[PDB]
Write a protein that binds this ligand. Structure first.
Ligand SMILES: Cc1ccc(OCCN(C)C)cc1C(=O)N[C@H](C)c1cc(-c2cnn(C)c2)cc(-c2cncs2)c1
Ligand SMILES: [Cl-]
Ligand SMILES: [Cl-]
Ligand SMILES: [Cl-]
Ligand SMILES: [Zn+2]
Ligand SMILES: [Zn+2]
Ligand SMILES: [Zn+2]
Ligand SMILES: [Zn+2]
Ligand SMILES: [Zn+2]
Length: 296
């Protein structure tokens, strides 16, 4: 049977699989060169060749890029080989093929409230919290055009993931000095420049178009992401939801994830380290907000 979304299966009935069905993938491995066998007979992924499959493909993945299915299947061939151990109630990834940014992003995703627009992302996202995050990690690579082993940046991975999610209800009003602007969607949840969410509310010096300082006026969202170039940062118990640590040179460095439970927990792959106070190089800090109205 040939399916493009795995929730809409179509029946089909020597000649290589590629000449019969086009590009054919079984369990994330190309069987285009492979011939039919009595063992193969099952369910095979195929790039859509008719409008019925093209419509079903968009309904599940929300993309029409034909290379998407091939890159997703190729990424899935590696992710299912990875082990996904659960540490401190969170589904992480055992480090393999430079996935330190994937695991840090996966740990951060389970702790922020997010609804994905494509059903493929959402179904795998629920499966990811359950412990089966193979399809979810492969989809992340496919939507981000990143390949397995490629060096990935967490705040960029989040940026593309936030674009494929419902952030319409998120909103941010910023005033720079008196001129205030409104940011909606991904811009409302992300800011590059500083890690302290308090500093963002108090004001940050920004280049004036005339010459200014930038302060937050209103924030209606379920969370806020604060990004900055990697620098030594002090993390206190209860001030942050989670953070991402970067230790190394540009692109080459390793990614580590710190979360704030009853004590600060630090997750590197499958390893977990606990400390009451943690000071280290941090590039992204995540904060939980529901509504903010400035006192200014
Ligand atoms: C792992 C990785 C993979 C891919 C990747 O791609 C980026 C290019 N992209 C456009 C495709 C980046 C990274 C990556 O090293 N990220 C860390 C967080 C980082 C960031 C920044 C940074 C971000 N903004 N500014 C203004 C500075 C600086 C450094 C360092 C500089 N000197 C020593 S460390 C490290
Ligand atoms: Cl879309
Ligand atoms: Cl989408
Ligand atoms: Cl918080
Ligand atoms: Zn969409
Ligand atoms: Zn691999
Ligand atoms: Zn001015
Ligand atoms: Zn404490
Ligand atoms: Zn790494």
């Amino acid at each position: 049977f040939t399916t493009v979304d795995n929730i809409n299966l179509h029946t089909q009935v020597s000649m290589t699989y590629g000449q019969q069905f086009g590009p054919t993938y079984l369990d994330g491995a190309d069987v285009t060169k492979i011939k039919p066998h009595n063992s193969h007979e099952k369910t095979f992924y195929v790039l859509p060749n008719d409008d019925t499959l093209r419509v079903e493909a968009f309904e599940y993945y929300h993309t029409t890029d034909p290379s998407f299915l091939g890159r997703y299947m190729s990424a899935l061939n590696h992710t299912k080989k990875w082990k996904y151990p659960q540490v401190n109630g969170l589904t992480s990834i055992k480090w393999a093929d430079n996935n330190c940014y994937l695991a840090t992003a996966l740990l951060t995703l389970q702790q922020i409230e997010l609804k994905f627009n494509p059903p493929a992302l959402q179904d795998a996202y629920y499966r990811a919290r359950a412990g089966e995050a193979a399809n979810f990690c492969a989809l992340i690579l496919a939507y981000c055009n990143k390949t397995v082993g490629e060096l990935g940046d967490v705040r960029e991975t989040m940026s593309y993931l936030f674009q494929h999610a419902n952030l319409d209800s998120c909103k941010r009003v910023l005033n720079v000095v008196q001129q205030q602007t409104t940011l909606k969607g991904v811009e409302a949840v992300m800011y590059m420049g500083t890690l302290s969410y308090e500093q963002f509310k108090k004001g940050v010096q920004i280049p004036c178009t005339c010459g200014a300082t930038k302060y937050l006026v209103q924030q209606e969202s379920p969370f806020v992401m604060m990004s900055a170039p990697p620098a030594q940062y002090e993390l206190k118990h209860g001030t942050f939801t989670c953070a991402s640590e970067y230790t190394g040179n540009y692109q080459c460095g390793h990614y580590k994830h710190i979360t704030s439970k009853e004590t600060l927990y630090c997750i590197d792959g499958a390893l977990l380290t606990k400390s009451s106070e943690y000071k280290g190089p941090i590039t992204d800090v995540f904060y939980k907000e529901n509504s903010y109205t400035t006192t200014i």
